[PDB]
Design a protein around this nucleic acid. Structure first.
Ligand SMILES: [Mg+2]
Ligand SMILES: [Mg+2]
Ligand SMILES: [Mg+2]
Ligand SMILES: [Mg+2]
Ligand SMILES: [Mg+2]
Ligand SMILES: [Mg+2]
Ligand SMILES: [Mg+2]
Ligand SMILES: [Mg+2]
Ligand SMILES: [Mg+2]
Ligand SMILES: [Mg+2]
Ligand SMILES: [Mg+2]
Ligand SMILES: [Mg+2]
Ligand SMILES: [Mg+2]
Ligand SMILES: [Mg+2]
Ligand SMILES: [Mg+2]
Ligand SMILES: [Mg+2]
Lengths: 56, 93, 203, 148, 162
RNA sequence: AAUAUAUUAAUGUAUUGAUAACCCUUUGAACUUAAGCAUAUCAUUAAAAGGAGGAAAAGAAACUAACUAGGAUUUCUUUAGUAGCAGCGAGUGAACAAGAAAUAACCCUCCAUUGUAAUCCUUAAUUGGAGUUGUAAAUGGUUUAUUCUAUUAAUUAUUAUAGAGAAUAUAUUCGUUAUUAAUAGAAUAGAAUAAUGUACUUGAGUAGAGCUGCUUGGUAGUGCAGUUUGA
């Protein structure tokens, strides 16, 4: 979640998913911020809240 | 539910005692008090009264005691401090 | 003895003596600036109980505050929000006017540290206070055990953190059930430990 | 150990999960929390929870829990309060001795009614015997004393 | 909400501010480590100090006795110690407490004689380190939990019991 | 150089900048929830500014209770999603008692023996000052022994106090294991050297009232502040 992407909207013959803004490289214009995007975070990230021990 | 149980209450009996403390946090000093009470009677003679205390004297010269009580209740807070001040002013008038 | 005849004289501030003497000093203060330097304190017996000692390295100053509320400053009364919070005029400050007198004199002199302050006299427009400041880097105050505590590291700028006795009262500390807030340290320390839920190991 | 398969593993391959096609699974249809108790969730409050709305009674600020403590046992279980060693000795040999029970020494304050176990007289100490507990203790031949 | 449930009450920021107890077995190792390292610094002296016996205030815990904080100086006057001398031995002193009865004063006065009959005093620390005496580590003379006792009485006295 | 102090325009002393976690003050929103929304909630939050330390803040009752009574501060369990607050709607929300970790109390403010400022800074120097509108501050680091921490350097079988692991080829080494040395720092104890008079202080433009605004579960102040008045 490091970048600052935002969706471009409809009317451009392109998908709705968030695009990397800016310009000047091959990176600008690619998708972000989704589990089905490359170099994007996964849905339901694991955490240390999980119960590690049981009680007998 | 506390009402009916309070009507019947018996206290466990213990023998009492009264012993004064070895080192108290407050030692009443007789010498230290009498210098404060003697110095105040000297300073009130050289200095005068407050401008609200001068008006309360001249009202008490007309014997408007019921008028002078509401005059001091508006200035000071409590009713006890009014009746302590009237005894100081009725002597000086 | 002579400590008691002076303290009873300077207590009654409505008498014939003190009304005469306070009128002269106010006319002396208006010719001066904001902060100026006096040699000996005006209220001698009051300043002595607050820790003053006639030693070299103990200095006294006098400042002034304008005695009123302070207005919020927006362009036209537009706060750009809801109507729950749009009041401008009737808002009271957080600390007393004794505390704001210390921040003025403490900022102008970064050389020294502050001890205490008290009231002197009033006008229509101003309130006058006297501040007592002491040098930490003098060799006469670095050596005695009576004031050796003020040369520590944690005693720098006690006004900006609210540790002097003038501004300590506004934080609301004490014993009992009336001070249920600030039950640990400060106000914000009491709130943080109450909201957070504890997740133990076995549960 | 004994285990059960989750319901998600049986649900792969079907176009939806168990949520239908016409009425889809959206976020928060009907509001969040317990909202709408007076307009459109009126029928749910009527069947399962009457007395939710309104005020009743007198309000007391700061009830003290420790000052209003009261524990109760029946009159029947007073022979069970006697410890296991000396309870046997009263049965077989010391058949004439009368046991003395202090209910506050075990942590009970009030004695509600019931029937005593055996036909021997006893001595009971507590606070606030009920009216049935005064009756069935004295029927055997006992005595009740209000104890601090 | 489409069945028979109780009214749920779960706050909105319940899981947003969380404190986790991951360091629980590692904390208990450290506390026993500094406790054992403090024991060698004062070798012949015990680890803890003496405490008095008091009653609990309310009516729910009225029949329970408990280790209090400190001794009033009047109970030391019965035993014969002075408060500047008794602080150097392992005795705790409280000055805020007030005396109430005779039974609670004769109990604490008897307890001070038992502590004085056990301690010894050497000359200097070089003499004390050389003697090998077992060092106590727990609480010093605690209270013990009572067992209830039922008294057996004869048949005649129940008409005139108190 | 700037803002200030000390000595005689010159000289000495102190502050200024960096932080992206924890701590103490100031200022302070809206998206959102209520199936709309304006009091309410998000929130004593995010952003922003000021100030210090390896921790900071707090701390020796103008308390809690109604018992046969407890005893400075801090932290954990529990009381408790309770008493209560609120278009009494959505929602929010404490304390005593009880079981533990850790324990420690003290100093100024009078008239301190007036048969004597006995004090304090600075100078190689009663040298120059400060101070009676009231200053008062006992001193020796030598040596011996023990324990702990950090960093460097050295020796380790081929039976084994060494079968943790790496590297080469298809029986050998570094280490592990177990021992010493050097330097720096800290603590405890012994021996020796230095040193011991007199001390009856209790907190004012404060505490509290009238009007006004914020805050809290506090309900007709729980706490704070401006103005007038003020024991
Ligand atoms: Mg990734
Ligand atoms: Mg402090
Ligand atoms: Mg579908
Ligand atoms: Mg549906
Ligand atoms: Mg449909
Ligand atoms: Mg949100
Ligand atoms: Mg809405
Ligand atoms: Mg909606
Ligand atoms: Mg809307
Ligand atoms: Mg708020
Ligand atoms: Mg600490
Ligand atoms: Mg501190
Ligand atoms: Mg809140
Ligand atoms: Mg003196
Ligand atoms: Mg080898
Ligand atoms: Mg006082």
């Amino acid at each position: 979640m490091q970048h600052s992407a935002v969706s471009w909207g409809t009317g451009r013959a392109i998908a709705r998913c968030p695009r990397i803004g800016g310009g000047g490289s091959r990176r600008s214009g690619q998708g972000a911020f989704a589990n089905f995007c490359r170099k994007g975070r996964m849905a339901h990230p694991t955490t240390t809240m999980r119960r590690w021990c049981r009680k007998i | 539910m506390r009402r009916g149980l309070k009507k019947t209450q018996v206290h466990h009996q213990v023998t009492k005692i009264d012993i004064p403390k070895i080192m108290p946090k407050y030692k009443k000093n007789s010498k230290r008090i009498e210098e404060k009470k003697f110095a105040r009677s000297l300073v009130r003679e050289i200095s005068g009264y407050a401008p609200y205390e001068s008006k309360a004297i001249s009202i008490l010269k007309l014997k408007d005691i019921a008028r002078a009580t509401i005059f001091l209740k508006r200035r000071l807070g409590s009713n006890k401090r009014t009746q302590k001040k009237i005894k100081e002013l009725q002597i000086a008038a | 003895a002579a400590a008691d005849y002076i303290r009873e004289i300077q207590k009654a501030k409505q008498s014939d003596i003190m009304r005469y003497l306070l009128r002269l000093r106010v006319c002396e203060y208006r010719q001066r600036g904001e902060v100026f330097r006096v040699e000996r304190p005006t209220f001698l017996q009051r300043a002595r109980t607050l820790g003053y000692r006639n030693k070299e390295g103990v200095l006294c100053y006098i400042a002034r505050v304008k005695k009123g509320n302070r207005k919020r400053e927006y362009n036209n009364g537009n706060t750009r929000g809801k109507c729950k919070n749009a009041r401008i005029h009737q808002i009271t400050p957080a600390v007393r006017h004794q505390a704001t007198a210390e921040q003025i004199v403490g900022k102008r002199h970064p050389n020294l540290r502050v001890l205490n302050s008290y009231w002197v006299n009033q006008d229509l427009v101003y309130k006058y206070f006297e501040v007592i400041m002491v040098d930490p880097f003098h060799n006469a105050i670095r050596n005695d055990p009576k004031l050796n505590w003020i040369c520590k590291g944690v005693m720098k700028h006690r006004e900006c953190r609210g540790l002097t006795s003038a501004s300590k009262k506004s934080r609301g500390l004490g014993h009992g059930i009336k001070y249920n807030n600030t039950i640990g340290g400060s106000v914000r320390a009491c709130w943080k430990r109450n909201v957070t839920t504890s997740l133990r190991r076995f549960r | 150990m004994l285990k059960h398969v989750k319901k998600t593993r049986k649900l792969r391959g079907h176009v939806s999960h168990g949520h239908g096609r016409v009425g889809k699974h959206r976020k928060h249809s009907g509001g969040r929390g317990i909202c709408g108790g007076l307009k459109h969730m009126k029928t749910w409050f009527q069947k399962y929870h009457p007395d939710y709305f309104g005020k009743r009674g007198h309000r007391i600020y700061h009830r003290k829990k420790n000052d209003e403590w009261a524990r109760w046992i029946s009159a029947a279980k007073l022979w069970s309060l006697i410890p296991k060693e000396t309870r046997y000795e009263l049965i077989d040999k010391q058949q004439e001795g009368v046991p003395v029970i202090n209910c506050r020494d075990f942590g009970y304050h009030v004695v509600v009614g019931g029937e005593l176990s055996l036909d021997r007289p006893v001595v009971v100490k507590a606070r606030k015997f009920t009216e049935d507990a005064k009756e069935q203790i004295e029927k055997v031949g006992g005595k009740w004393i209000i104890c601090p | 909400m489409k069945n028979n449930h109780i009214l749920p009450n779960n706050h909105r920021n319940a899981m947003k501010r969380v404190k986790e107890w991951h360091n629980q077995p590692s904390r208990a190792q450290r506390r026993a480590k500094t406790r054992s390292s403090k024991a060698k610094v004062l070798y012949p002296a015990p680890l803890k100090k003496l405490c008095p016996i008091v009653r609990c205030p309310t009516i729910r815990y009225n029949k329970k006795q408990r280790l209090g904080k400190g001794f009033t100086p009047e109970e030391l006057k019965e035993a014969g110690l002075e408060v500047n001398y008794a602080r150097r031995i392992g005795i705790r002193v409280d000055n805020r407490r007030r005396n109430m009865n005779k039974e609670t004063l004769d109990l604490n006065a008897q307890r001070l004689k038992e502590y004085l009959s056990k301690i010894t005093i050497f000359k200097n620390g070089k003499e004390a380190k050389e003697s090998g005496v077992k060092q106590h580590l727990g609480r010093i003379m605690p209270v013990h939990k009572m067992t209830p006792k039922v008294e057996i009485i004869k048949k005649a006295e129940v008409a005139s019991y108190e």
